[PDB]
């Protein structure tokens, strides 16, 4: 069995993916992905920067679900700090996490389809994803990497003309999803290129740690935002799609239904949006209003000592876990009691999904491996931290 | 060659909250100025490990 070197230097296979594998000529036996080409070194760099300076690390990891990533860090810091966040901040955080889920699902679906060969829905879905990156542009400073969510609440309040635009988008997003789905689900080629590909049993998914869509594509109803609801999700009404067969087609259907449920949750959060402040007030971990630190002494002191020293998290350690679009994303914070984290390991959902590729491509075609890569939605920012 | 010592309390402030901790002081005294922007350059990897 001869060995050929994969590892294309372009994002047409997500880039940064060596993937040396064994070939019998047409059927692959063992595929060995060589991760580490994107080991930037965030985990070592976390310990050298305060709890505020370390927030933008989390946007870079899994750089398609930006606000779904810093949300886990914020929740971990809040748990370590016993900080209570106001209701409006919780609702807008849930809304923006759902927007991240929609963005990730769209990007994953179209990148996977373009890997298969269908290239026309790709540009349609990026046309629709323009409208949500514009929403990100509005609330925060930057389109993609938005440090909107902070440990206290969110960084800044929503602009006045935002909810109208969001609802106008949600009016037609369902029709756009239907248009994208009609080209793939009912198609013939899509079925023969996905059905009975990369089947994973529930026992295999549990053993290999496939929490996320891979776990739910095997019949396991394990949704972290329903099993362990963190923000205001009990109030919200949504369903958890669960597959029957562990093939790639049911994962695609599950992702489509997840986009539907995310749209439903966005509508619910838009309807049930309370007033009030956005940043917390119990502990002192939030900056004073810039119209307040310029005429008060204690407020200016707090601003100075927060933007230089930062808040000191009391010495403890914990493992938070949120439902990232990829799957379960968890941050293992260890606090020394000082203003810098002692150790912050990042549990990337894509790491386990990528290691579990070896048994998924067991006795498949070589071109049957790119579709397995696409269906598990691997970005290498999170895999190599 | 390293020096093991406990940093003393700073004179300017009366708090003793940074005391009782011991540090290893690698003598990384080799630093120069980049002749374009005045930045401080180093060639010793232990410039601030002990700090």
């Amino acid at each position: 069995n001869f060995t050929l070197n994969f590892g294309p230097q372009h994002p047409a296979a997500h880039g940064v993916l060596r993937l040396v594998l064994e070939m019998n000529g047409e059927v692959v036996e063992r595929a060995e992905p060589h991760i580490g080409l994107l080991h930037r070194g965030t985990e070592k760099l976390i310990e050298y920067k305060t709890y505020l300076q370390a927030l933008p690390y989390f946007d870079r990891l899994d750089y398609v679900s930006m606000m779904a990533q810093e949300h886990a860090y914020s929740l971990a810091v809040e748990k370590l700090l016993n900080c209570e966040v106001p209701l409006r901040a919780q609702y807008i955080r849930v809304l923006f996490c759902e927007i991240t889920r929609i963005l990730n699902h769209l990007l994953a679906l179209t990148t996977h389809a373009m890997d298969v060969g269908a290239l026309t829905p790709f540009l349609w879905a990026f046309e629709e994803r323009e409208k949500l990156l514009e929403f990100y542009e509005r609330v925060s400073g930057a389109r993609m990497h938005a440090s909107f969510i902070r440990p206290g609440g969110v960084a800044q309040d929503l602009p006045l003309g935002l909810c109208r635009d969001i609802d106008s988008f949600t009016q037609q997003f369902a029709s756009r999803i239907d248009e994208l789905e009609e080209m793939l689900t009912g198609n013939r080629i899509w079925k023969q290129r996905l059905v009975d590909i990369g089947t994973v049993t529930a026992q295999q998914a549990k053993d290999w740690g496939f929490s996320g869509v891979m776990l739910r594509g095997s019949g396991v109803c394990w949704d972290l935002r329903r099993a362990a609801p963190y923000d205001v999700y009990d109030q919200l009404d949504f369903d958890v799609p669960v597959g029957t067969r562990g093939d790639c087609y049911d994962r695609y259907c599950i992702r489509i239904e997840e986009m539907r449920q995310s749209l439903r949750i966005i509508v619910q959060c838009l309807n049930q949006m309370p007033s009030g402040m956005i940043k917390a007030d119990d502990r002192k971990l939030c900056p004073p209003s810039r119209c307040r630190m310029k005429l008060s002494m204690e407020s200016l002191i707090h601003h100075f000592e927060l933007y230089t020293e930062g808040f000191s998290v009391p010495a403890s350690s914990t493992y938070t876990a949120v439902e990232a679009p990829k799957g379960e994303f968890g941050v293992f914070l260890v606090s020394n009691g000082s203003n810098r984290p002692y150790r912050c390991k990042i549990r990337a959902p894509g790491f386990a999904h990528s290691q579990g590729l070896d048994f998924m491509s067991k006795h498949h075609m070589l071109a049957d491996v790119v579709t397995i890569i696409g269906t598990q939605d691997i970005v290498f920012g999170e895999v190599d931290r | 060659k390293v020096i093991i010592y406990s940093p003393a309390r700073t004179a300017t402030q009366s708090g003793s909250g940074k005391l009782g901790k011991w540090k290893i002081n690698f003598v990384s005294t080799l630093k120069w100025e980049n002749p374009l922007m005045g930045w401080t350059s180093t060639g010793d990897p232990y410039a601030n490990v002990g700090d």
Binding site: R290, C291, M293, K294, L295, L300 | -
Partner: protein
């Protein structure tokens, strides 16, 4: 203009006249867009320089 350095450009601005003993300087007309409020006790024969703004204040009469 850009030939004049800001140090030599602020000196030519005439000092403000204040009737009282202390004057509060907030930078710009809008308080939120200027420096933090600074109360300066102008009592000497020389103008009192605002440490943030550089503006000078002179007391004419009580």
């Amino acid at each position: 203009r850009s030939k004049k350095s800001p140090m030599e450009l602020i000196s030519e601005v005439p000092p403000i006249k204040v009737d009282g003993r202390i004057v509060a300087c907030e930078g710009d007309t809008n308080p939120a867009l200027g420096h933090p409020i600074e109360f300066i006790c102008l009592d000497l024969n020389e103008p009192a320089i605002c440490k943030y703004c550089g503006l000078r204040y002179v007391q004419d009469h009580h």
